[PDB]
Design an enzyme around this catalytic site. Structure first.
Site, mmCIF file in Angstrom:
data_model
loop_
_atom_site.group_PDB
_atom_site.id
_atom_site.type_symbol
_atom_site.label_atom_id
_atom_site.label_comp_id
_atom_site.label_asym_id
_atom_site.label_seq_id
_atom_site.Cartn_x
_atom_site.Cartn_y
_atom_site.Cartn_z
ATOM 1 N N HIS A 119 16.749 -27.868 -29.291
ATOM 2 C CA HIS A 119 15.974 -28.724 -30.154
ATOM 3 C C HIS A 119 15.965 -28.143 -31.562
ATOM 4 C CE1 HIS A 119 12.773 -32.025 -29.830
ATOM 5 N NE2 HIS A 119 12.937 -31.795 -31.127
ATOM 6 N N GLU A 164 18.851 -35.093 -30.005
ATOM 7 C CA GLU A 164 19.256 -35.874 -31.176
ATOM 8 C C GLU A 164 20.416 -35.268 -31.943
ATOM 9 O OE1 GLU A 164 15.840 -36.829 -33.707
ATOM 10 O OE2 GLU A 164 15.008 -38.117 -32.163
ATOM 11 N N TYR A 293 11.373 -44.932 -32.562
ATOM 12 C CA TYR A 293 10.171 -44.909 -33.447
ATOM 13 C C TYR A 293 9.940 -46.182 -34.270
ATOM 14 C CZ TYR A 293 9.495 -39.956 -32.302
ATOM 15 O OH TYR A 293 9.224 -38.779 -31.656
ATOM 16 N N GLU A 349 10.954 -39.677 -26.275
ATOM 17 C CA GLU A 349 10.029 -39.629 -27.420
ATOM 18 C C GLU A 349 9.671 -41.034 -27.867
ATOM 19 O OE1 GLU A 349 11.259 -37.234 -30.852
ATOM 20 O OE2 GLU A 349 11.983 -35.560 -29.534
#
Ligand SMILES: N#[N+]C[C@@H]1[C@@H](O)[C@H](O)[C@@H](O)[C@@H]2O[C@H]12
Ligand SMILES: [Cl-]
Length: 443
Positions: A119, A164, A293, A349
């Site tokens: 991460h 990501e 998001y 997420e």
């Protein structure tokens, strides 16, 4: 009422550099985020990860908050330079002990660990040898993954290779907004490709070492909408989905090549014989993690860096300036099933930043967040009813934390952190989420 499947996995998510602090305690090596954030100008207010939420000391308490909320899964990341301070070679036992304690406690409390291997906190030592630019990182990353699997795979059975990789590649090496802070398009595409190679190698080693676990990978996604019915707006959208969303990586994983519109833009930046690596890249994965998001209005634009720009819109927005589009999380779930049909999906997420205050009454009335979460969970429920194999949902984040180049100025937590004292205050959104997990769904 919107009940979810039996055994559906309700989660909260964190990452190591964002919450731990004490980046050099107990023999840890420096990371690229330590050096990047200590460089003047890179991060809002000069913030660093030096202290953060101080989770490196308060970890038992934070997990006690997870247990107290009855949340069933915890997605957390491992700091590579706590485990191997030079990146390869020497294993730091104290780094392994820190994570062993978190793993054992979670299992004691019947909480399911999902470990993110990477991460974003690359060892600085490897950045000095090129980082993600250097083809040798596929070996470095495999050796690190192997250390983790050996030490923790008896207890952890749900594993994520990369978080990501588009952001890691493009925001880190093309926009220079994230560590290691570079602006070179050829490096950035060599990094995309090395991330794939590294991912695949870790998967290969995992099959040799943890013969009963599951392993996946996590992608950022936006819900892109075209500005018009026009010439090329629908194509901008096509391009943005293929470059910015899961297909940049899943086209190689599933089909053995980069997506069409990606090679149109970037064939010149990818290595010459990149296809020589594509059969190893197709190493089978057990699931796909999708992060989501916001959504974006996009247009063909002849002046933009890559023929695409964002048309702003009058929609509710978070403190990030991100447009709230709850139906994107449905759209992306439908689209992944449709395009690549992975056996299991997780929302790894979803969350939002708002200017949270503690009220005179001791509480954080983050109704804007309850609304955001409730709406997106509803759209995920919908995709389940249309056959998307969604097995879990992870709220970003258990805690307010270091939000990368934004510093501590953006709060995404369901628990508020007062940084002056390190006190945790469960927000309304958190009590709320607790009830969603108790009921296994909405209303
Ligand atoms: N921004 C909030 C959030 C960030 O804090 C995470 O570490 C990333 O995985 C992803 O960028 C989204
Ligand atoms: Cl190289």
């Amino acid at each position: 009422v919107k009940k979810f499947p039996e055994g559906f996995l309700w989660g909260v998510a964190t990452a190591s550099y964002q919450i731990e602090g004490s980046p050099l305690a107990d023999g840890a090596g420096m990371s690229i985020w330590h050096t990047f954030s200590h460089t003047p100008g890179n991060v809002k207010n000069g913030d660093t990860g030096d202290v953060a939420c101080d989770h490196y000391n308060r970890w038992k308490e934070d997990i006690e908050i997870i247990e107290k909320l009855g949340v069933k899964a915890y997605r957390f990341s491992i700091s590579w330079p706590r485990i191997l301070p030079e990146g390869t070679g020497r294993v730091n036992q104290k780094g392994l002990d820190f994570y062993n304690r978190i793993i054992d406690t979670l299992l004691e409390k019947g909480i399911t660990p999902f470990v993110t291997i990477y991460h974003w906190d690359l060892p600085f030592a490897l950045q000095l040898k090129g980082g993600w630019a250097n083809r040798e990182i596929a070996d470095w990353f495999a050796e690190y993954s192997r250390v983790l699997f050996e030490n923790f795979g008896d207890r952890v059975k749900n594993w994520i290779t990369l978080n990501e990789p588009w952001v890691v590649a493009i925001v880190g090496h093309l926009y220079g907004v994230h560590a290691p802070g570079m602006r070179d398009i050829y490096v950035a595409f060599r990094a995309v490709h090395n991330l794939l190679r590294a991912h695949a190698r870790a998967v290969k080693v995992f099959r040799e070492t943890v013969k009963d676990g599951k392993i996946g990978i996590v992608f950022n996604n936006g819900y892109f909408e075209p500005a018009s019915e026009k010439e090329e707006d629908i194509r901008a959208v096509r391009f943005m989905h293929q470059f910015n969303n899961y297909p940049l990586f899943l086209n190689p994983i599933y089909r053995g090549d980069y997506p069409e519109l990606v090679l149109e833009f970037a064939r010149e930046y990818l290595p010459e014989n990149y296809k020589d690596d594509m059969s190893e890249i197709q190493e089978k994965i057990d699931f796909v993690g999708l992060n989501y998001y916001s959504g974006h209005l996009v247009k063909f634009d002849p002046d933009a860096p890559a023929k695409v720009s964002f048309v702003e819109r009058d929609l509710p927005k978070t403190a990030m300036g991100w447009e709230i589009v709850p139906e994107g999380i449905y759209w992306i779930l439908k689209k992944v099933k449709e395009e690549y049909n992975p056996p299991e999906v997780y929302i790894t997420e979803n969350g939002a930043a708002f200017d949270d205050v503690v009220s005179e009454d001791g509480r954080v009335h983050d109704q804007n967040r309850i609304d955001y979460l409730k709406a997106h969970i509803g759209q995920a429920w919908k995709a389940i009813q249309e056959g998307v194999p969604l097995k879990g949902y992870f709220v970003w984040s258990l805690l307010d934390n270091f939000e990368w180049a934004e510093g501590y100025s953006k709060r995404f937590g369901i628990v508020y952190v007062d940084y002056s004292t390190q006190k945790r205050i469960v927000k309304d959104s958190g009590y709320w989420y607790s009830n969603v997990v108790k009921n296994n769904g909405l209303e």
